Amino acid sequence: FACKTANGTAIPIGGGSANVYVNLAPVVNVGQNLVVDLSTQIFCHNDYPETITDYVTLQRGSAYGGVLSNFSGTVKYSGSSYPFPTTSETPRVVYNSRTDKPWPVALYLTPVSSAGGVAIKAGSLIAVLILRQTNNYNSDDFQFVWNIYANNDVVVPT
Amino acid sequence: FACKTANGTAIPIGGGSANVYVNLAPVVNVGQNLVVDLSTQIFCHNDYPETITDYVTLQRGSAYGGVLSNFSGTVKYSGSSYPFPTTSETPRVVYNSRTDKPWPVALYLTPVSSAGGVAIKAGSLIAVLILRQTNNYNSDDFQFVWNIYANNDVVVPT
Numbered sequence A, B: 001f002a003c004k005t006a007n008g009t010a011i012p013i014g015g016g017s018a019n020v021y022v023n024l025a026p027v028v029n030v031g032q033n034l035v036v037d038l039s040t041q042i043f044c045h046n047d048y049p050e051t052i053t054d055y056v057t058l059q060r061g062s063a064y065g066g067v068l069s070n071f072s073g074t075v076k077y078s079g080s081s082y083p084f085p086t087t088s089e090t091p092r093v094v095y096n097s098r099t100d101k102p103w104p105v106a107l108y109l110t111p112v113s114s115a116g117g118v119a120i121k122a123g124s125l126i127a128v129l130i131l132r133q134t135n136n137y138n139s140d141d142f143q144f145v146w147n148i149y150a151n152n153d154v155v156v157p158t
């Protein structure tokens, strides 16, 4: 099992970490959502799908920087919604093909009432999403740590 | 502060996520209302009511699946009606008792004019409702994310 990002980088068999940059709506009002859909950027596959089933969870989602201080949010994983930052490891998604399949994670972030001005700075760390992968064959239990960075400033009008 | 569901589960202190399975009227004609009353399903309480006031909002209500596609509606929160899907956080409801009390949320949904046949599929996600809880004591600010599923098909007759 391993993962890659679109025109990006890879995390090899056995896990590891990578940095992922996201484009954000440059202006978001209180009451609106910034939707950060990682399913178009992070893809994973099963290396032995004929004999082994891989199981993949969102182990944890954490907020950093301007997202931690200026937004409230939720994360959607494979059709289910959760608080972000997360409070538990999600149920598992099965990976059963060598064909790259999206990791179905999206953040829905909305400004808190105190946000104003530049609420997320370009280039800054905004989140960490930890993917945990196991299987039905051996003791493999690996973390794929995705450090999420903003491409651009996000302004909350005042 | 924590919450529970009818014959169900709990989301404990600090928030989290749960699934709520609801029985829906099996037949709703164009021109009739489908009512999804969560006040009979979701109940919450304040853990220190002698010294602390808990404040609870519907931060956001989102529609999915057949409700998103085939119905238009509003949401009623503690006696006032708002658009659904929602466009802003509601006013606060006070929780001031240790006894579990309803979360006073109901969806009032009516089929769109072109809807017919199976308009909501049994087992499908129909809504996500975010309960946001704060207090007048400390910095606690917690989300309770309710994933709402239909237990049965809803047919719009033709």
Ligand code: NI
Pocket: A001, A002, A045, A046, A047
């Ligand atoms: Ni491979």
Ligand code: NI
Pocket: B001, B002, B045, B046, B047
């Ligand atoms: Ni209690």
